[PDB]
Amino acid sequence: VKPNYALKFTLAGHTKAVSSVKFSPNGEWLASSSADKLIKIWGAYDGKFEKTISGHKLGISDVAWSSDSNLLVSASDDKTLKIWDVSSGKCLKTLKGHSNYVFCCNFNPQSNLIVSGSFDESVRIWDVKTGKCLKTLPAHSDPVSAVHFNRDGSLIVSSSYDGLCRIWDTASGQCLKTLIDDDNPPVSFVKFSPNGKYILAATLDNTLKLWDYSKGKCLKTYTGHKNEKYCIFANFSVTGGKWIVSGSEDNLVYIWNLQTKEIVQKLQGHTDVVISTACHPTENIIASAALENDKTIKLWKSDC
Amino acid sequence: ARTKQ
Lengths: 304, 5
Fold this sequence. Notes:
The complex is a heterodimer.
Chain A: E1 6-11, E2 18-23, E3 29-34, E4 39-43, E5 49-53, E6 60-65, E7 71-76, E8 80-85, E9 91-96, E10 102-107, E11 113-118, E12 123-127, E13 133-137, E14 144-149, E15 155-160, E16 165-169, E17 175-179, E18 187-192, E19 198-203, E20 207-212, E21 217-222, E22 234-237, E23 243-246, E24 253-257, E25 263-267, E26 274-279, E27 285-290, E28 297-301
Antiparallel strand pairs in A: 1-28, 2-3, 3-4, 4-5, 6-7, 7-8, 8-9, 10-11, 11-12, 12-13, 14-15, 15-16, 16-17, 18-19, 19-20, 20-21, 22-23, 23-24, 24-25, 26-27, 27-28
Chain B: no helix or strand
Protein backbone atom coordinates (compact mmCIF):
# COMPACT_ATOMS: atom_id res chain seq x y z
CA VAL A 1 0.00 0.00 0.00
CA LYS A 2 1.21 3.50 -0.90
CA PRO A 3 -0.30 6.82 0.24
CA ASN A 4 -1.59 9.39 -2.23
CA TYR A 5 -0.74 12.72 -0.63
CA ALA A 6 -1.80 15.63 -2.85
CA LEU A 7 -1.35 19.38 -2.46
CA LYS A 8 -4.38 21.09 -0.92
CA PHE A 9 -3.18 24.50 0.30
CA THR A 10 -0.19 26.82 0.07
CA LEU A 11 0.41 29.15 3.03
CA ALA A 12 2.25 32.38 2.21
CA GLY A 13 3.26 35.18 4.53
CA HIS A 14 6.74 34.60 5.89
CA THR A 15 9.29 37.00 4.42
CA LYS A 16 12.36 34.81 4.91
CA ALA A 17 12.95 31.05 4.88
CA VAL A 18 10.65 28.99 7.06
CA SER A 19 12.55 26.98 9.68
CA SER A 20 9.98 24.68 11.27
CA VAL A 21 6.31 23.69 11.19
CA LYS A 22 4.40 21.81 13.90
CA PHE A 23 0.76 20.76 14.32
CA SER A 24 -0.91 21.45 17.66
CA PRO A 25 -1.72 18.27 19.64
CA ASN A 26 -5.45 19.00 19.45
CA GLY A 27 -5.08 19.05 15.64
CA GLU A 28 -6.62 22.48 15.16
CA TRP A 29 -3.53 24.57 14.37
CA LEU A 30 -0.26 24.65 12.49
CA ALA A 31 2.53 26.82 13.90
CA SER A 32 5.41 27.98 11.73
CA SER A 33 8.68 29.72 12.58
CA SER A 34 10.99 31.61 10.27
CA ALA A 35 14.28 33.42 9.85
CA ASP A 36 12.03 36.53 9.65
CA LYS A 37 11.83 36.44 13.51
CA LEU A 38 8.10 35.62 13.40
CA ILE A 39 5.81 32.78 14.46
CA LYS A 40 2.62 32.36 12.47
CA ILE A 41 -0.47 30.34 13.39
CA TRP A 42 -2.62 28.76 10.67
CA GLY A 43 -5.69 26.56 10.51
CA ALA A 44 -4.57 22.95 10.19
CA TYR A 45 -7.36 21.86 7.83
CA ASP A 46 -7.89 24.88 5.58
CA GLY A 47 -4.59 26.77 5.93
CA LYS A 48 -6.44 29.87 7.13
CA PHE A 49 -4.03 32.45 8.49
CA GLU A 50 -4.81 33.12 12.17
CA LYS A 51 -2.16 35.39 13.75
CA THR A 52 1.46 36.48 13.88
CA ILE A 53 3.44 36.18 17.11
CA SER A 54 6.43 38.52 17.42
CA GLY A 55 9.12 39.40 19.96
CA HIS A 56 12.38 37.65 19.10
CA LYS A 57 15.18 39.93 17.96
CA LEU A 58 16.71 37.50 15.43
CA GLY A 59 15.57 34.51 13.41
CA ILE A 60 13.86 31.48 14.92
CA SER A 61 15.05 27.90 14.30
CA ASP A 62 12.35 25.87 16.06
CA VAL A 63 8.92 26.04 17.70
CA ALA A 64 7.06 23.47 19.80
CA TRP A 65 3.59 23.09 21.34
CA SER A 66 2.67 22.19 24.90
CA SER A 67 0.57 19.07 25.51
CA ASP A 68 -2.67 21.05 25.97
CA SER A 69 -2.13 23.14 22.78
CA ASN A 70 -2.17 26.36 24.82
CA LEU A 71 1.53 27.30 24.84
CA LEU A 72 4.34 27.51 22.31
CA VAL A 73 8.07 27.68 22.91
CA SER A 74 10.47 29.07 20.31
CA ALA A 75 14.27 28.88 19.93
CA SER A 76 16.09 31.86 18.45
CA ASP A 77 19.46 33.12 17.26
CA ASP A 78 18.99 35.92 19.85
CA LYS A 79 20.25 33.25 22.33
CA THR A 80 16.89 32.94 24.12
CA LEU A 81 13.80 30.82 24.08
CA LYS A 82 10.39 32.37 24.58
CA ILE A 83 7.23 30.78 25.98
CA TRP A 84 4.08 32.13 24.34
CA ASP A 85 0.40 32.06 25.20
CA VAL A 86 -1.07 31.15 21.82
CA SER A 87 -4.49 32.67 22.55
CA SER A 88 -3.17 36.10 23.56
CA GLY A 89 0.04 36.01 21.52
CA LYS A 90 1.86 37.32 24.60
CA CYS A 91 5.36 36.37 25.65
CA LEU A 92 4.98 34.75 29.08
CA LYS A 93 8.67 34.09 29.78
CA THR A 94 12.05 34.60 28.14
CA LEU A 95 14.52 31.82 28.91
CA LYS A 96 18.02 33.28 29.13
CA GLY A 97 21.24 31.34 29.64
CA HIS A 98 22.56 29.90 26.41
CA SER A 99 25.67 31.67 25.15
CA ASN A 100 24.94 31.22 21.43
CA TYR A 101 22.10 30.49 18.98
CA VAL A 102 19.34 28.26 20.34
CA PHE A 103 18.60 25.68 17.67
CA CYS A 104 15.99 23.27 19.01
CA CYS A 105 13.37 22.97 21.73
CA ASN A 106 10.58 20.76 23.06
CA PHE A 107 8.16 20.41 25.98
CA ASN A 108 7.95 17.24 28.02
CA PRO A 109 4.58 15.43 28.05
CA GLN A 110 3.79 16.95 31.46
CA SER A 111 4.59 20.30 29.81
CA ASN A 112 6.26 21.61 32.97
CA LEU A 113 9.77 21.38 31.47
CA ILE A 114 11.36 22.58 28.27
CA VAL A 115 14.54 21.10 26.81
CA SER A 116 16.71 23.19 24.50
CA GLY A 117 19.86 22.66 22.48
CA SER A 118 22.28 25.29 21.28
CA PHE A 119 25.29 26.17 19.16
CA ASP A 120 27.01 26.57 22.55
CA GLU A 121 27.11 22.70 22.61
CA SER A 122 24.91 22.46 25.72
CA VAL A 123 21.47 21.07 26.47
CA ARG A 124 19.41 23.00 29.01
CA ILE A 125 16.32 21.98 30.99
CA TRP A 126 13.98 24.81 31.98
CA ASP A 127 11.05 25.22 34.38
CA VAL A 128 8.01 26.35 32.37
CA LYS A 129 6.32 28.15 35.28
CA THR A 130 9.31 30.20 36.48
CA GLY A 131 11.19 30.34 33.20
CA LYS A 132 14.43 29.57 35.03
CA CYS A 133 17.07 27.04 34.04
CA LEU A 134 17.09 23.91 36.17
CA LYS A 135 20.01 22.01 34.64
CA THR A 136 22.75 22.64 32.10
CA LEU A 137 24.12 19.48 30.48
CA PRO A 138 27.59 19.63 28.83
CA ALA A 139 26.09 17.36 26.26
CA HIS A 140 28.24 17.57 23.13
CA SER A 141 31.41 18.97 21.58
CA ASP A 142 29.71 20.71 18.64
CA PRO A 143 26.35 22.42 18.05
CA VAL A 144 23.30 20.51 19.29
CA SER A 145 20.90 19.89 16.41
CA ALA A 146 17.88 18.31 18.12
CA VAL A 147 16.44 17.49 21.56
CA HIS A 148 13.35 15.39 22.36
CA PHE A 149 11.63 13.89 25.43
CA ASN A 150 10.35 10.32 25.36
CA ARG A 151 6.73 9.42 26.03
CA ASP A 152 6.80 9.42 29.85
CA GLY A 153 9.25 12.33 30.08
CA SER A 154 11.94 10.34 31.88
CA LEU A 155 14.44 10.47 29.01
CA ILE A 156 15.90 13.08 26.66
CA VAL A 157 17.62 12.27 23.36
CA SER A 158 20.04 14.81 21.87
CA SER A 159 22.01 14.92 18.62
CA SER A 160 24.97 16.98 17.49
CA TYR A 161 27.33 17.86 14.69
CA ASP A 162 29.91 16.01 16.79
CA GLY A 163 28.44 12.82 15.27
CA LEU A 164 26.88 11.54 18.49
CA CYS A 165 23.41 10.75 19.71
CA ARG A 166 23.10 10.68 23.48
CA ILE A 167 20.28 9.66 25.80
CA TRP A 168 19.99 11.53 29.10
CA ASP A 169 18.15 10.86 32.32
CA THR A 170 15.82 13.85 32.78
CA ALA A 171 15.74 13.82 36.57
CA SER A 172 19.51 13.70 37.13
CA GLY A 173 20.86 15.07 33.85
CA GLN A 174 23.31 12.16 33.63
CA CYS A 175 24.10 10.30 30.42
CA LEU A 176 22.51 6.88 29.98
CA LYS A 177 23.76 5.90 26.51
CA THR A 178 25.77 7.12 23.51
CA LEU A 179 24.91 5.96 19.96
CA ILE A 180 27.70 6.01 17.34
CA ASP A 181 27.64 4.73 13.75
CA ASP A 182 29.99 4.46 10.73
CA ASP A 183 32.49 7.40 10.51
CA ASN A 184 30.42 9.68 12.83
CA PRO A 185 28.88 12.04 10.23
CA PRO A 186 27.10 15.03 11.81
CA VAL A 187 23.76 14.01 13.29
CA SER A 188 21.30 16.64 12.13
CA PHE A 189 18.06 15.41 13.74
CA VAL A 190 16.86 12.90 16.30
CA LYS A 191 13.58 11.96 17.96
CA PHE A 192 11.95 9.09 19.83
CA SER A 193 9.35 6.92 18.15
CA PRO A 194 5.76 7.25 19.46
CA ASN A 195 6.17 4.24 21.78
CA GLY A 196 9.61 5.44 22.90
CA LYS A 197 11.21 2.14 21.93
CA TYR A 198 13.04 3.46 18.87
CA ILE A 199 15.05 6.53 17.93
CA LEU A 200 15.00 8.04 14.43
CA ALA A 201 18.20 9.89 13.51
CA ALA A 202 19.24 11.86 10.43
CA THR A 203 22.88 12.24 9.43
CA LEU A 204 24.40 14.57 6.85
CA ASP A 205 25.30 11.69 4.55
CA ASN A 206 21.83 11.42 2.99
CA THR A 207 20.75 8.79 5.50
CA LEU A 208 18.01 8.30 8.08
CA LYS A 209 18.45 5.53 10.64
CA LEU A 210 16.04 3.82 13.03
CA TRP A 211 17.70 2.65 16.26
CA ASP A 212 16.50 0.25 18.94
CA TYR A 213 17.12 2.24 22.12
CA SER A 214 17.24 -0.69 24.55
CA LYS A 215 19.66 -2.74 22.42
CA GLY A 216 21.60 0.21 21.01
CA LYS A 217 21.37 -1.29 17.50
CA CYS A 218 20.48 0.00 14.03
CA LEU A 219 17.29 -1.65 12.72
CA LYS A 220 16.47 0.25 9.51
CA THR A 221 18.07 2.73 7.13
CA TYR A 222 16.20 5.04 4.76
CA THR A 223 18.00 6.48 1.75
CA GLY A 224 17.26 8.06 -1.62
CA HIS A 225 16.87 11.69 -0.54
CA LYS A 226 19.40 14.54 -0.41
CA ASN A 227 20.58 15.74 3.00
CA GLU A 228 24.19 16.93 3.27
CA LYS A 229 23.77 20.54 4.45
CA TYR A 230 20.72 21.33 6.56
CA CYS A 231 19.13 20.08 9.77
CA ILE A 232 15.96 18.66 8.21
CA PHE A 233 13.21 17.30 10.46
CA ALA A 234 11.87 13.78 10.06
CA ASN A 235 8.62 12.23 11.27
CA PHE A 236 6.79 9.04 12.04
CA SER A 237 3.43 9.06 10.25
CA VAL A 238 0.98 6.96 12.27
CA THR A 239 -2.54 8.03 11.30
CA GLY A 240 -2.81 5.68 8.30
CA GLY A 241 0.01 3.62 6.86
CA LYS A 242 3.15 3.56 9.00
CA TRP A 243 5.58 5.82 7.14
CA ILE A 244 8.76 7.78 7.68
CA VAL A 245 8.49 11.34 6.32
CA SER A 246 11.32 13.79 5.64
CA GLY A 247 12.16 16.85 3.60
CA SER A 248 15.09 16.87 1.21
CA GLU A 249 17.59 19.22 -0.39
CA ASP A 250 16.20 18.38 -3.86
CA ASN A 251 12.99 20.28 -2.95
CA LEU A 252 10.85 17.13 -2.45
CA VAL A 253 9.06 15.56 0.49
CA TYR A 254 10.11 11.90 0.83
CA ILE A 255 7.84 9.21 2.28
CA TRP A 256 9.15 5.71 3.07
CA ASN A 257 7.50 2.49 4.18
CA LEU A 258 8.82 2.11 7.73
CA GLN A 259 9.16 -1.70 7.61
CA THR A 260 10.36 -2.23 4.04
CA LYS A 261 12.40 1.02 3.75
CA GLU A 262 11.11 1.57 0.19
CA ILE A 263 10.19 5.05 -1.01
CA VAL A 264 6.42 5.12 -1.47
CA GLN A 265 5.89 8.76 -2.51
CA LYS A 266 7.81 11.93 -3.37
CA LEU A 267 5.80 15.16 -3.07
CA GLN A 268 6.67 17.75 -5.73
CA GLY A 269 5.84 21.44 -5.46
CA HIS A 270 8.34 23.36 -3.36
CA THR A 271 10.97 25.48 -5.13
CA ASP A 272 13.68 25.28 -2.45
CA VAL A 273 15.02 22.85 0.16
CA VAL A 274 12.23 21.35 2.27
CA ILE A 275 13.63 21.99 5.75
CA SER A 276 10.67 20.87 7.87
CA THR A 277 7.77 18.44 7.69
CA ALA A 278 5.07 17.67 10.24
CA CYS A 279 2.40 14.97 10.43
CA HIS A 280 -1.09 15.75 11.71
CA PRO A 281 -2.03 13.93 14.95
CA THR A 282 -5.36 12.47 13.71
CA GLU A 283 -5.72 13.06 9.95
CA ASN A 284 -3.58 11.92 7.02
CA ILE A 285 -2.19 15.43 6.52
CA ILE A 286 1.43 16.53 6.07
CA ALA A 287 2.71 20.10 6.34
CA SER A 288 5.99 20.99 4.62
CA ALA A 289 8.06 24.17 4.61
CA ALA A 290 10.90 25.44 2.45
CA LEU A 291 13.86 27.83 2.42
CA GLU A 292 14.44 31.30 1.02
CA ASN A 293 13.53 30.89 -2.65
CA ASP A 294 10.11 29.49 -1.69
CA LYS A 295 9.21 30.73 1.81
CA THR A 296 5.85 28.91 1.80
CA ILE A 297 4.19 26.13 3.75
CA LYS A 298 2.24 23.45 1.90
CA LEU A 299 -0.52 21.20 3.25
CA TRP A 300 -0.95 17.77 1.67
CA LYS A 301 -3.70 15.21 2.25
CA SER A 302 -3.91 11.47 1.58
CA ASP A 303 -6.71 8.89 1.58
CA CYS A 304 -4.65 6.45 3.67
CA ALA B 1 19.81 29.66 12.32
CA ARG B 2 18.53 26.42 10.79
CA THR B 3 17.86 28.16 7.45
CA LYS B 4 21.55 28.96 6.85
CA GLN B 5 24.41 26.65 5.88
